Paper text:
One of these proteins, Acidic Mammalian Chitinase (AMCase), is an enzyme known for its ability to function under acidic conditions in the stomach but is also active in tissues with more neutral pHs, such as the lung. AMCase is a member of the glycosyl hydrolase family 18 (GH18), the members of which hydrolyze sugar linkages through a conserved two-step mechanism where the glycosidic oxygen is protonated by an acidic residue and a nucleophile adds into the anomeric carbon leading to elimination of the hydrolyzed product. We found that mAMCase has maximum activity at pH 2.0 with a secondary local maximum at pH 6.5, pointing to a bimodal distribution of activity across pH. Mutations Lys78Gln, Asp82Gly, and Lys160Gln result in the loss of surface-stabilizing salt bridges in hAMCase and may contribute to its reduced activity at more acidic pH. It is likely that the dual pH optima of mAMCase is intrinsic to the catalytic mechanism, where Glu140 can be protonated directly from solution (at low pH) or through proton shuttling across the catalytic triad (at neutral pH).
Across 20 chains from the datasets derived from different pH and co-crystallization conditions, we quantified whether Asp138 is preferentially oriented towards Asp136 (inactive conformation) or preferentially oriented towards Glu140 (active conformation).
Author numbering: 22 to 397
The structure:
Amino acid sequence: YNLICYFTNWAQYRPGLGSFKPDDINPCLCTHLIYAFAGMQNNEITTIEWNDVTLYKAFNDLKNRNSKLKTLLAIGGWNFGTAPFTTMVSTSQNRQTFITSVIKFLRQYGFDGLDLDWEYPGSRGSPPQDKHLFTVLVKEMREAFEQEAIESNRPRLMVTAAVAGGISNIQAGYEIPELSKYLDFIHVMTYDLHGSWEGYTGENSPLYKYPTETGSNAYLNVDYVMNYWKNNGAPAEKLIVGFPEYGHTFILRNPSDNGIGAPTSGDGPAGPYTRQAGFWAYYEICTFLRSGATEVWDASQEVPYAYKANEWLGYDNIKSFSVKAQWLKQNNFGGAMIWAIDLDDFTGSFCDQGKFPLTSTLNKALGISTHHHHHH
Ligand SMILES: [Mg+2]
């Protein structure tokens, strides 16, 4: 199994114990590290943060401490939107300019591949032709990577993609059978499946549906989404299940109604480190849990929730990570990906569960820190 760990280049700005940079990553926890995010200007890949060049070097230097480790650079993300991708895929000239720039950039800085995180082809302003043009891009990139490996006599750069977990976005965005042939791995965003924007409490990454859910609400769970990808053409071994190391917060409209589906008035309060209303890192969650919150196991969905007065949290913990890891092995998927390693209790000082408690849970469950043949 693989364990793919996203690192974000804005975690460094968080105050105090929240600041996280590549040298804080345990090089043995994951099989692959993915750097989020690069940008694009005039159809060429580029940096975004002022010190990305320095961070790229520290990130790829982690491979000097783990000979099995591979790194990828992710391009795009939610804030980046779709317009640069639409322009880039619109012509063969622009796709070639982009692919050439990617090979050069990955080799320049020491990355082993590119993770495409276009959110999403065919949505958020992207026109309908982008569904097929995304396939064309990926095919052309895979072929260019295959050719560069032979010409340079080196292991091939990998092409992966982070892909939607919502059924409407999946159907508008992806030609699953052909796309899956050319991607090396498919990183499915099986999280953000509920949130305060819906007006009621719900879980971030529930494994199964809640018993009341019918119609399209019955699709909002990890099991349905991963099986949708598999059943519509993606091989199980290329499918990577998304695991969030964060939770979503809500304000309860009625504090006496604190189960699933309780009406809410908006996002919960921003945490002091991540400073984003509606979102808490796992280490911020532990502070909440230890400050008088009531924790409930949502047995139908195999995830915890917690509440305190009018604050409600849908999240994941060691138990839910363990349950979902057991399930992914039972279903022969390729592994797990975490959003994001900088949200784990990397110092160990918030949760009293050791360093990197959520990431370590997946490393142990998926046999990541193991060997087969004796070696030098
Ligand atoms: Mg964030």
